[model samples]
Target: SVQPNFQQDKFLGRWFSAGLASNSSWLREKAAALSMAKSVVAPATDGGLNLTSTFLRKNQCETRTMLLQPAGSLGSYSYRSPHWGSTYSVSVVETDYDQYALLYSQGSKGPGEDFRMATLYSRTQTPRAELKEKFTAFCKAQGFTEDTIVFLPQTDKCM
Candidate 1:
């Protein structure tokens, strides 16, 4: 398995859409057609958390936020996004010290509807095919379809 870059601090910042994966045809189409923005938390007194674009079926404007926890620890992380209009309790799963993580909102009874989104941010303008291939493998290991990810068009935008 590929390891997280312990020196991931070099990757902090925004990244434009590169690809996506979805089993639903509509979701796949939308992901292939829509734009996406991903942001990594800046190092500060607060621990770094990641953020991404949330495409709602009805909302014109998008929602975005990070999963912040005390000292960057896994679990007990709170989600701050436009949907909640404020910070809410959430959990960070599949987290590593390198800052790669998956966020989840807890449900009253069990796990709430979970959305699948993962980002690989880099300091450079683009990632090499080898790196992306490794990323694809990682996503597949996590239960996502590696072949389904579609690379989207990117511009000079910050993210």
Candidate 2:
């Protein structure tokens, strides 16, 4: 029942994949697929409020862009890709005033079929662990499993 802070321009930028919803064995296997992909998106052009990202996986990048539509409600498409594409939806489940956010995404239906992806991102590359922990707890409170997410590697310095 949480909405993203669209008033600030800070959320729109490059973000590294920190964690996600993986309720099934197959979903768990798909975890490593996100490695090669850099989640990127531009701000919502309309005040209607929406954010889009690419669901690229390790060694495999999606040439066809992913689109996230805001239903203008608590939950958006939550997982709708283009035609003939994988069925997945994501949303900003939680966030702090500092701009760090917890993103949750999953399949259209079924358990182990759904997934939750958590990201601890800021305007900068170096984010504190405390912030990450706080967001992780936030995800858990929202029904994300303990093993649903795994942190990606980060460079001490961003290129």
Candidate 3:
């Protein structure tokens, strides 16, 4: 597992989900159509993060907040979502602070369960071609099949 040198201060801002990959096709479909898929990261006193994410679901905007704490490793964090019964492991795979980021997350509701997701985030809704290429390469390096990756669309309708 490759981890990036994460900078909490530099990561505090809004990021748009530009790409997504997962083992579940249902999840991929849901993510691809997401609009206003935004994540706001705030610095926490414990050198962690407070994440507020909002996205359009069923034609309505839904919001969820989670407290992310460092998990004894650089670029690794643990967070529990109110909607989920399990704790999630989040890894910052790559980022440039100002433009793009690649994140991986995995969690399950119980033992012997498997659920994982990978996301490519961008500072802007419409990312540059170079950034998209970088995201594709990163996903490939992470062993995600090309068929499983979906490029999410950006829209003003959600706003």
Candidate 1, residues 87-120: lDDT per residue as tens digits?
4444433334332333333322223234444444
lDDT of 2 by residue, 41-78 (tens): 56454432344334444434443344565545543444
TM-score of each: 0.51, 0.62, 0.84
Task: List the global CA lDDT of all models.
Answer: 0.46, 0.52, 0.77
Q: Rank the candidates by lDDT, best first.
A: 3, 2, 1
In candidate 1, which residue pairs get closer than 3 Å at backbone N, Cα or C atoms, i.e. clash? Answer: none
Residue 46 C-alpha lDDT in model 3: 75
TM-score of 3: 0.84
Stretches of candidate 3 exceeding 4 Å from the true structure: 2-4, 81-83, 108-113
- Pick the TM-score winner: 3
Clashes of 3: 0
**Native-referenced Cα lDDT, model 3:** 0.77
The ten-residue window of minimal lDDT in model 2 covers 47-56
lDDT of 3 by residue, 22-132 (tens): 877778877777675677888777778888878887788888777888787877888765555577788887788899888988773443136677888889888999888
